[PDB]
Curated annotation (Swiss-Prot), chain A:
Whole sequence portion shown: 57 to 107 of 112
Membership in a protein family: Belongs to the eukaryotic ribosomal protein eL34 family.
Superkingdom of the organism of origin: Eukaryota
Gene: rpl3401
First and last residue of the signal peptide: none
Keywords per UniProt: Cytoplasm, Ribonucleoprotein, Ribosomal protein
GO molecular function, one term: structural constituent of ribosome
Protein known as: Large ribosomal subunit protein eL34A
Compartments in which it is found: Cytoplasm
Organism: Schizosaccharomyces pombe (strain 972 / ATCC 24843)
Curated annotation (Swiss-Prot), chain B:
Transmembrane segments: none
UniProt protein name: Large ribosomal subunit protein eL38A
Source taxon at top rank: Eukaryota
Family under the similarity heading: Belongs to the eukaryotic ribosomal protein eL38 family.
Any GO BP: cytoplasmic translation
Record keyword Protein transport present: no
GO cellular component: cytosol; cytosolic large ribosomal subunit; preribosome
Quaternary state and interactors: Component of the large ribosomal subunit (LSU). Mature yeast ribosomes consist of a small (40S) and a large (60S) subunit. The 40S small subunit contains 1 molecule of ribosomal RNA (18S rRNA) and at least 33 different proteins. The large 60S subunit contains 3 rRNA molecules (25S, 5.8S and 5S rRNA) and at least 46 different proteins.
Species of provenance: Schizosaccharomyces pombe (strain 972 / ATCC 24843) (Fission yeast)
Subcellular location: Cytoplasm
Curated annotation (Swiss-Prot), chain C:
Organism: Schizosaccharomyces pombe (strain 972 / ATCC 24843) (Fission yeast)
Presence of keyword Nucleus: yes
Family affiliation: Belongs to the pescadillo family.
Gene Ontology cellular-component annotations: nucleolus; nucleoplasm; nucleus; PeBoW complex; preribosome; preribosome, large subunit precursor
Protein name: Pescadillo homolog
Keywords: Coiled coil, Nucleus, Ribosome biogenesis, rRNA processing
Length: 51, 70, 432
RNA sequence: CAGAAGAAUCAUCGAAUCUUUGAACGCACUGCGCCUUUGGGUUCUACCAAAGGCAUGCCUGUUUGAGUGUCAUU
RNA sequence: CCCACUGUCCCUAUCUACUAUCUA
RNA sequence: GCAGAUCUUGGUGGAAGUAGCAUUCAAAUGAGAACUUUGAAGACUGAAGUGGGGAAAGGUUCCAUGUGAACAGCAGUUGGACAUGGGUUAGUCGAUCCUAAGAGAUAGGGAAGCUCCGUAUGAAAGUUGCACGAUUUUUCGUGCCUAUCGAAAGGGAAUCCGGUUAAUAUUCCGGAACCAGAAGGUGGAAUCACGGCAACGUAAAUGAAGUUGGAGACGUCGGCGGGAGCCCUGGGAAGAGUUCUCUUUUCUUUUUAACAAACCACACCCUGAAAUCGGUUUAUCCGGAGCUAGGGUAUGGUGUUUGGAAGAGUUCAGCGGCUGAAUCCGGUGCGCUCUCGACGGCCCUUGAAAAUCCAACGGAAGGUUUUCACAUCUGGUCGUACUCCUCCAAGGUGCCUCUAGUUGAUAGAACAAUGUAGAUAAGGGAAGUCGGCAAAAU
RNA sequence: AGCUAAAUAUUGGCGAGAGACCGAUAGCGAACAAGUAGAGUGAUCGAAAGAUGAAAAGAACUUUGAAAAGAGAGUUAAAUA
């Protein structure tokens, strides 16, 4: 719809019920979630080796 | 203009103060059209049997200024 | 036309936040609060807080914009600014080592009169008489507190004078109706010009400041009430024809005469009229003198309680001798010895009470609070089920907003209190 | 010409009114704002109207400030 | 240069409209 | 003190009444009609109009009534002339708002100076920049973040139909909608909601500071698909034709708006693991970075059924405004016009900005919230008449015709010579002229 | 480093009184209407135009004509005003 007409729609009608829904795609959301977890593990692994 | 298919809600929206005028249309198909004028929307109802149509004439409140065919 | 910008009118325009009210008046919080004490201003919460807060949700106090705009043109605000200027000139005078110029500055210190504040807050005298009880409660509370570095000695002296003048008026006009005794203090209830006045006087004891209360706030309330009481007392004395203010006997005050120092020279109210009570050195004279003289009874008291006693200990004219001490070595005759609760019970019930029951060393009848009214069913100290359930679980079944839910508190609390104090009479009878 | 009956298209002139502009001064060149106060209407947290305000440089004063500027402070 | 063609020419003639002319 | 100065100003002569400047019939009006009006006939533009609209520009030229003084290379009963009055109606159309290249005041610096340079520049650059607080020695502390002009063709909240004037209509009348903002109220919802493996769905389902994301917002070309209108055409109906006969024939017409309801198909998800390569475009594109196939999800370009809505409009019949009927069923195409979708190239310089709106992360705070439904109210200012770089554009075979618009351009009479233009010509055929220059030949 | 009346100048500004001046192609561009009509995108340029009679008594009325006007008439000392 038009940018001005988007206001009239309900909150649930403009956003998808998921984390980062309505701003990032589901495939991108899955990739972002996976990448963050792996990077966190690498930081945990690197910290243990450095310790 | 919302086409209305529920007689009971047509009755309650007629009793509600928003209703102003009502018109009855008799087309060639022996169908009776109840048009109710509201503040913003014109609600219409199509009935096909005369006895229910007549019964809903007398069920409408007398305060409503109903009118016949135009 | 133009597209109306969201939130440019309505609650967002009518209500103003506290911080925005501060920056609008160019005031500090301490001065904004102080002007809000003197004027009649208070927070107001809107129905839609989020809408009034420009779509935000943080908990923020609101004021009427019209209330704030009324404070833009307040002559007192310019007096707050004049005090800031004077305080800095006093600082420069002392910092430069000019003691005499500091004294001159202190003499011309900017002071402001609360005349127009009282007028614009209370247009008519009866309006003042309505919300005069809170002022009287505080002036009596602070007339017995010790002087602090926060609240001055002049303020304490004025509170005593204003309180004593009002007590003198009530005694003179016999406007007192009821006097009730509680752990908090003494609750007095009088009527003036039809309006009802209820205040509290604490017992004089060497208390300690709680150190958790902000005495800056107490300063502004004391300043407002003292101005309010002064003008009220002036009108009341003019109504009675007494010249205002009544003269102060310095010698009598130096001897702690209490109310006797102030002489009101002219410019069932007779419950105890035919009686001459005597006060021993164990009773609240500051309370007993007030009530007995208000209802016509003549008063004599122990010399150590204050000079100016018209009666002596040996005077046989004494009708009753109030003495709370459980032992009286020099017992008199014809001066029947009672307890203080006898007088106040008589005041509350408007009738003479049983001196035998209130005699020294006897049991004490329970104290009745005249302010407590008889409830619908509360204990005064002195085939159907199917229809019932159907008529009781249909509003909680069918009714839209279930506003019937208020019964869960109105009836519940009243019934629980009624059940407790109704079963109490059963327990006490069983104990007896 | 018509019409009206201290008149007057009179004189004098010390009291007033003086629309939009223009050094032109809220911003622009049909408009767009902000601030203070007051008022209205089938009628009030909305809308509207009215009145008085808001240019720049500088001078005297006032108030409020800033400074790892110059110091004082048992 | 050859061939064809034609009023360019011998040698002009005829037709048509417009122009030209007169009238208000 | 004037005869002269190609003298100055004014007035007036001969030249000189000289040079000169596709209509027809009858009727009406008028003192008067080659020029006005009506009717008939004959012609001209021929959708690229002499057509119908707008921009700029003009200013009342728009309409009605009156006049025939000055205009009229002629005249008028006549003009865009004169006189007198009338005429432009908007919450939805434009401006107003935003920014573009640039311009430009302010800060500072020049310059004797009228002034010039300079546009976040060594500016204390914040319209109430924002929040916090039982009030802080009733003298304010802590924390955070840090110009204006310039587009009536770019961006952008919202309206349609029918009717109506001598002249105005998305504006007025009648009917029907829509947008924005504002508060309460009523009903419903959660105690910071559930379901689905998933893509995601639903009547709702708080979100401070702080941090991001999206729309706006983006080149050009080609082919394909979809829809609408227009064009073509079969019937049905109506009327008007033509009709000795033939011709179930000829011509003309046959409407549904904004808006509101229910339903109606390429990107992704789930099972799946594939080449013996499959699917497939008009144009070979994709596939272990997971094909074909099966089941879903979303996006609905659209289409279906209505409401609006027949009460309107149009066309036929009548009656005296009223009453009847019909306004139907198709078929279609490299058709034209407009738009949307899915591709494929070429790019190169990989393709404005801002206003504005939405969402995410975040977790401050706590009868509350509630992005669900319904009622109620308001919408200012300016342009709007008319005239005219650009819009709309029928059929058949460069012509002809329909729709539409004119029939005016000073007229009449004669047709010698002259001049221009266009033709034909016996015999010869370039003998003409400096010469096949122009014609015919091809 | 500084101030200071009078005598002095004066095509403007507010008024005045005059003249061996000009007498409507003159005198100011403008005696009236004047920086006006008009011209030019603009800066700017820039005219022509005075006289009925003492009084409007400005020609009633009749007639011809569509009208403009004509002819009788009338007003005036005079319409050869």
């Amino acid at each position: 719809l038009r940018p001005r007409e988007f206001a009239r729609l309900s909150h649930n009608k403009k956003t998808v019920q998921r984390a980062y829904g309505g701003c990032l795609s589901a495939n991108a959301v899955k990739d972002r979630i996976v990448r963050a977890f792996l990077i966190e593990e690498q930081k945990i692994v690197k910290q243990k080796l450095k310790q | 203009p919302r086409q209305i298919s529920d007689i009971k809600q047509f009755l309650e929206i007629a009793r509600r103060k928003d209703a102003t005028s009502a018109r009855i249309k008799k087309n060639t198909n022996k169908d009776v059209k109840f048009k109710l004028r509201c503040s913003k929307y014109l609600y219409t109802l199509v009935v096909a049997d005369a006895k229910k149509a007549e019964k809903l004439r007398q069920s409408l409140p007398p305060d409503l200024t109903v009118t016949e065919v135009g | 036309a133009r597209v109306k910008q969201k939130g440019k009118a309505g609650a967002a325009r009518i209500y103003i936040t506290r911080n925005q009210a501060l920056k609008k008046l160019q005031l500090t919080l301490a001065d904004f609060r102080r002007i809000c004490i003197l004027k009649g201003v208070y927070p107001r919460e809107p129905k839609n807080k989020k809408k009034a807060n420009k779509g935000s949700t943080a908990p923020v106090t609101f004021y009427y914009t019209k209330d704030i705009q009324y404070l833009l043109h307040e002559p007192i605000v310019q007096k707050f600014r004049e005090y800031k200027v004077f305080a800095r000139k006093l600082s420069k005078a002392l910092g430069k080592g000019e003691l005499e110029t500091a004294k001159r500055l202190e003499a011309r210190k900017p002071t402001y009169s609360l005349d127009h504040i009282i007028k614009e807050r209370y247009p008519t005298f009866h309006d003042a008489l309505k919300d005069i009880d809170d002022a009287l409660s505080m002036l009596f509370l602070f007339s017995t507190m010790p002087v602090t570095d926060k609240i001055g000695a002049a303020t304490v002296a004025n509170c005593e004078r204003l309180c004593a003048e009002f007590q003198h008026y009530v005694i003179r006009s016999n406007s007192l109706r009821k006097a009730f005794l509680s752990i908090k203090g003494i609750y007095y209830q009088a009527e003036i010009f039809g309006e009802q006045i209820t205040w509290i006087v604490p017992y004089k004891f060497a208390q300690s400041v709680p150190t958790d209360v902000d005495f800056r706030i107490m300063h502004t309330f004391l300043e407002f009430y003292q101005a309010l009481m002064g003008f009220v007392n002036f009108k009341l004395y003019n109504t009675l024809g007494l010249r205002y203010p009544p003269k102060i006997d310095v010698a009598k005050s130096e001897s702690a005469a209490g109310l006797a120092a102030y002489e009101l020279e002219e410019s069932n109210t007779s419950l105890f009229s035919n009686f001459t009570f005597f006060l021993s050195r164990e009773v609240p004279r500051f309370s007993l003198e007030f009530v007995i003289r208000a209802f016509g009874g003549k008063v004599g008291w122990d010399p150590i309680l204050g000079s100016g006693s018209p009666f002596s200990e040996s005077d046989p004219v004494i009708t009753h001798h109030i003495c709370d001490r459980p032992h009286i070595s020099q017992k008199y005759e014809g001066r029947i010895y009672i307890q203080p609760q006898w007088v106040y019970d008589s005041i509350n019930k408007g009738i003479l009470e049983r001196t035998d029951l209130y005699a020294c060393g006897a049991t004490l009848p329970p104290h009745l609070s005249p302010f407590v009214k008889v409830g619908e069913n509360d204990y005064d100290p002195e085939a159907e089920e199917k229809e019932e359930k159907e008529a009781k679980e249909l509003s909680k079944m069918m009714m839209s907003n279930k506003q019937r839910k208020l019964y869960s508190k109105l009836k519940n609390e009243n019934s629980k209190n009624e059940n407790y104090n109704n079963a109490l009479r059963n327990r006490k009878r069983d104990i007896e």
